[PDB]
Amino acid sequence: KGXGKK
Amino acid sequence: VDMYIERAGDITWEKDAEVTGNSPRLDVALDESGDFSLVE
Amino acid sequence: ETTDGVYRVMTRRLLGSTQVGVGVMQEGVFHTMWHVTKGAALRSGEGRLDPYWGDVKQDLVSYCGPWKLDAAWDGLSEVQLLAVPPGERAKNIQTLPGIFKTKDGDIGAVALDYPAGTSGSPILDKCGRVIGLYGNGVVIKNGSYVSAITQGKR
């Protein structure tokens, strides 16, 4: 997710 | 102003599509900010 | 342009032209995830698309009209993510969704990992219907990404 959740 | 959209394709099922990814079953919570989190 | 289909969401504010996400045009309405546009107006050529509905908790927004996508995963069959990655051609990825189990019911989820700017890519059933959008998810003990199949109400 790029790092994240988005 | 700032953001713009550009067409990228038709929305269609592809016969010969690559198949992949698993199918996990996950307990999650969704908070008021719209963020999913894994539940203990 | 308003033709049905999948669209990149771009911005020229940062360096170069940058893809912040993706969305679906259907029945004259543009559908994407809230975290892609934060509810801002959008340019489509020399025209403008104004927000019409949105909800941070669902992480969804529609432009020019109400949310039009109402197909749902059948709980059994494989689906296809029509991934539109930054700078790359649209590609169909077929997969069997897993499931997010919540206090308020179960939602389909797809365990596929793409760049952040792929947010809003549509997930499709074998009839070509959009059953939800990709990009609101979680990261598991593996470190890998799983996205809900996020669908609105029509």
Give the SS3 label for residue B34: coil
Same domain assignment for residues C120 and C94: yes
Same domain assignment for residues C54 and C79: no
Same domain assignment for residues C79 and C150: yes
Q: How far apart are CA C110 and CA A5, in angstroms?
A: 13
Same domain assignment for residues C18 and C85: no
Q: Which residues pair with C137 in a beta bridge?
A: C147
Q: Do A1 and C136 touch (CB under 8 A)?
A: no
Q: Is C8 on the interface with B (CB under 8 A)?
A: yes
Alpha helices in chain C (DSSP H): 34-37
Numbers of helices and strands, H then E, in chain A: 0, 0
Instruction: Collect all residues of chain A within an 8 Å Cβ-Cβ radius of residue C137.
Output: 1, 5-6
Q: How many domains does chain B have?
A: 1
Helix H, strand E, coil C: the string for C72-93 is CCCCCCCEEEEECCCCCCCEEE
Q: How far apart are CA C116 and CA B17, in angstroms?
A: 22
User: Which range marks the domain in which residue C12 is found?
Assistant: 1-69
Same domain assignment for residues C118 and C43: no
Contacts of C26 (CB under 8 A, 6+ apart): B11, C4, C68, C69, C130
Method: X-ray
Instruction: Using the 3D structure, point to which of C42, C69, C96 is the last residue of a domain.
Output: C69
User: Which range marks the domain in which residue B6 is found?
Assistant: 2-40
E strand or H helix at B19, and its extent? strand B18-19
Q: How far apart are CA C80 and CA C93, in angstroms?
A: 5
Query: What's the length of chain B?
Result: 40
Q: How far apart are CA C105 and CA C98, in angstroms?
A: 14
Using alpha carbons, list the distances in angstroms from residue C23 to C61, C65, C102: 10, 14, 26
Closest residue of chain A to C21, computed from CA coordinates: A6
Same domain assignment for residues C26 and C83: no
Is residue C39 within 8 A of residue C52, CB to CB? The reply is no
What is the stated resolution of the deposited model, in angstroms? 2.0
Q: How many domains does chain C have?
A: 2
Decide: residue B12, CB within 10 A, 0-12 exposed, 13-18 middle, 19+ buried: middle
> Among candidates C47, C52, C46, C54, which has minimal Cα distance to C29?
C52
Which amino acid makes up residue C33? M
Q: How far apart are CA C90 and CA C118, in angstroms?
A: 10
> Among candidates C66, C25, C55, C59, which has minimal Cα distance to C42?
C25
Instruction: Using the 3D structure, point to which of C39, C69, C99 is the last residue of a domain.
Output: C69
Same domain assignment for residues C55 and C91: no
